[PDB]
Amino acid sequence: SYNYVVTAQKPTAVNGCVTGHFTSAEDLNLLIAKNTRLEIYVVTAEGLRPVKEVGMYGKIAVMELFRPKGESKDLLFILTAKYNACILEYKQSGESIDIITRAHGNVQDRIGRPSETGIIGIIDPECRMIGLRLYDGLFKVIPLDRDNKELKAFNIRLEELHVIDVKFLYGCQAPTICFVYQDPQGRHVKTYEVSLREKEFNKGPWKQENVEAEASMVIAVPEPFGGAIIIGQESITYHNGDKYLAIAPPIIKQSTIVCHNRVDPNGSRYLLGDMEGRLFMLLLEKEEQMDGTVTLKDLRVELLGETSIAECLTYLDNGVVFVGSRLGDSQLVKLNVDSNEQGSYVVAMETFTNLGPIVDMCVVDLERQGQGQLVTCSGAFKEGSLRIIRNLHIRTVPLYESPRKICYQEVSQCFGVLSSRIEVQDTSGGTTALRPSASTQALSSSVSSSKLFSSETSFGEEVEVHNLLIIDQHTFEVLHAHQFLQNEYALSLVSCKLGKDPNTYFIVGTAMVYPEEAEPKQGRIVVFQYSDGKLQTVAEKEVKGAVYSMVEFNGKLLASINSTVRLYEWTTEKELRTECNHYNNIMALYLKTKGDFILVGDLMRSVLLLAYKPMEGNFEEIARDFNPNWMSAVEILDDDNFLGAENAFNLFVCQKDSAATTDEERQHLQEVGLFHLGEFVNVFCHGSLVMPTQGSVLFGTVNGMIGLVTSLSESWYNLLLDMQNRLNKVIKSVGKIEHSFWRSFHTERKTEPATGFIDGDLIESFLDISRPKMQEVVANLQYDDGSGMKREATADDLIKVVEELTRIH
Amino acid sequence: YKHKCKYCSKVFGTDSSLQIHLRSHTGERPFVCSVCGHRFTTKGNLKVHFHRH
Amino acid sequence: LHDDDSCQVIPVLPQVMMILIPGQTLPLQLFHPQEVSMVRNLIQKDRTFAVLAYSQEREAQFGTTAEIYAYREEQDFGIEIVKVKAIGRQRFKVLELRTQSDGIQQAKVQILPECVLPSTMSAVQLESLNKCQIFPSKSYKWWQKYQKRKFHCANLTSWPRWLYSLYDAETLMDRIKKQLREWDENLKDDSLPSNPIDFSYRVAACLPIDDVLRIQLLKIGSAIQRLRCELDIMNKCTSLCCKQCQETEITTKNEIFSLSLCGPMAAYVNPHGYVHETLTVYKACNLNLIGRPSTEHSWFPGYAWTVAQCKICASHIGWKFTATKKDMSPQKFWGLTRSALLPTIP
Ligand SMILES: Nc1cccc2c1C(=O)N([C@H]1CCC(=O)NC1=O)C2=O
Ligand SMILES: [Zn+2]
Ligand SMILES: [Zn+2]
């Protein structure tokens, strides 16, 4: 089979933000990185004025601005996760806005272990070279000459393999690196001078024997001072030569500082963000001396207030900070001289919808219009939310805790959501909440009275408390919250009718997670009803393992328990009775169904096709395909084709073999499609957001992107594949990156060309080009219309075929 | 490969050296399984047991 | 080291009947001149030959290259006996085995690659917390921190951290090496490889498993899968039965212990060149002793052996050993041959 993949909603989470002068030398730009998108704004007095949005054929991994001597304005260096390096320039010709590629190249090395602390990309202050930390033991140096348009580079052998963070220092006689590494004898900071002449390392200005156990951040302090600030779990120190300061502010001991931003060019104020949303001001106390010098007297940290959980911060101007968020909405916040009555200098100005991460979703026709709305569990911790998405209208329902699974119960006209909040062990017996949240603020509440599990010592650490929430479908008010058993972990949730019972139930499958036990030996399948505003337990079945997955199966309840797939029957006495068991060697994580076929999958892309046999009351294994690789989600496209989401950000389709004469051939599922999506899919979902092609599968990803997969005719696939090669000859790609490279199936070890999949986003851009390029792509293109002869295609013919393909989302 | 001893299966270079040694296997149960060390009284007994390995 | 996915033609010694796992050593004793000259010509070119993993008859579908690293000549009693030690290297699937005039069958094999996978979190890890992916390493409260920090980003996927720990290599070995310390008191944490590839293969050669499970692990390419399958055998197949009659319990895993420095199951060689992977256990059941203890060629000096057989089918299962001095402990134990056993799940 042949498939078509299109973006219904672009990635919304922010993974980067730098400021500088990219568009005009005089303008102040804000540049935002959204996985495959780049956004440009100019900072105003009211807020942000949009300027230009683009997409790359890559995942943006390094985004930094720089200005080599003799340049009008700043240039843009971008490196993609597939190691496409490029330097871009802004070029506006009246109203023609264009991002031109001044230099570009691929920095990938065949040899080499990708580092544990990720791709690092730093540029020296004097814009003489681009430093790259790609692999353990090496350091890539791209020398910055106006005569290096191909980004040729070289490597320097790095002793000290496990490097945490590295930056170029300021005010140095030679380009100098400052980095924190870990070896057997503790964690240290060291400096290396970089010789672009000798292409190796020379001795560094200083090396500090030992530093904090968990020193994780290196900030290079600018030219007024020099040196570097290292930040850790409990301490903040300043190092330069023989000068040293160190503070251990108790105010930052409660969570980890994970991003920073320099406020002013002299480097005396920094913003620090931590993992829970606190925003701090790091201040460097300068001491003006009677000679010309300035000395640094002390360090001081002040808590500014709360924000979204920040992946990146960036100070704009006039007390306005941009908070870039992966787990919640991005913000513009305002800082005020005087803290308000509550003690916060922080005031919200603006929020930005971020759908990511989408951990679950479901399609509902609430408006009963035969339209359809997407309802997602998105965000984590205090950023957690439902989002109702419509044809694109986004409504938001704050939860202040992590939603995990969602399903719709039309009869009750409400939603049922499995949720997770963090509580901390109290000094009494129990555990007290971190903050008020949906779990704790319902209209009515309940706790499991089960006591099925009757035979540790928490200290002051975190525990997860899981709830089933009943959310009204019109107000989204939490109508009921049922708290599960202590140490019970709610995994699966389904709404359906069972057997000959006319009631619709919520069914929840769980696991009993104890920190001593590696694999779970105990779980529960609990049957809830919820009929008169109140939620009642209608029997519970104990099982000897984790109930990872559950499906309604033809009036019965199919379930995973560790490696077992089990079909359950609903008796007249309203309880679960096992019908049959199919024991697998793989752990049955994924469970999808279609008629009598059952798709089973584990985390390593082991794909299994069981079939229920009505005449024998048993399961029978039809076919299998094992291929060691991480799998994140999977779905049944039809009786013969299965779609999966595997590493790294790839989609795959396997199929039941039609060329099967031998019983060995019929028992192996062939791979028929490979594609680099660029996103990490958390959930597939059959459904459509609208009123040619066959089928409609939506999928949500971690970065909040929403995509659609549908299947085509062989006639249509062949034609659109010719178009892809033809549109790729006329569409200017930002980093001068080949589309066929970007969509190549990719592992850390393997790359194979994409196949059986058509890039719908590339297909739809046919409409946005002009008719000289338009008539250029159609030239000599034969087309399988109804007439059995294949005629040359007019472009006005092709506007009609693409305009129909846009109608699917 | 040449001149094997009927009891313990050890091979010798010449038939002279074989019967120099074959006088060592004098016992009530002389045939030895070249795998177990199990001992048997007849050649056939050892053959059957040897082929069950 | 051959190339990956490449095809090579490699000689096969016809006497060998052993499933060789990469890294495991294969001892040999050779009397026949064709094979003696065959070993001598190997100790010059590549030193590698192929060891087929038989399904038995002569039906083989995978195998392993083996590399000669030791060589000793004894010319006793007018017969040239050559003892050679080999070590297994690379796995392969057999394509054609053309038998040659002298005897040695040559093999066209496809060199199997070793599937290395990235961490299960490398796809989702937030760049702001890449700075935190390196831990000050080693307690069981320590392992509670390792999971909370290494899999923090599970909150971005539809699975918890404890499921991810079940596919974390580093966790799998700490669990496996927990039980190996139960079989070996002479076992330091440093005596075990640190690479997950090598570590899984060492565990493969150490478990007392029959050929079918030994072959099944060879077919497994990802180390993660190997480790989990190995940890599964260790947990479920607590009992060891007679492979012949299949229902007779000989011993259980609670009785496995290490007599020599070489672990609980080492490859010993009998006087006539037969190899025995001999698992040493404390107590054993359903066994008949044959003969009186002897010391000839006793693999454990100070002990006298006695042939042991199954009470039911009369198959060979191993030997009973007894102390010939008195100050020694254990005063008694059993050496069970691996080819005779069949792990089972009660
Ligand atoms: N003396 C003989 C003679 C024939 C076969 C064997 C032995 C002998 O000692 N072993 C084993 C079993 C007992 C032992 O510990 N070491 C061995 O070499 C044999 O297989
Ligand atoms: Zn003899
Ligand atoms: Zn025997």
Ligand SMILES: [Zn+2]
């Ligand atoms: Zn038996």
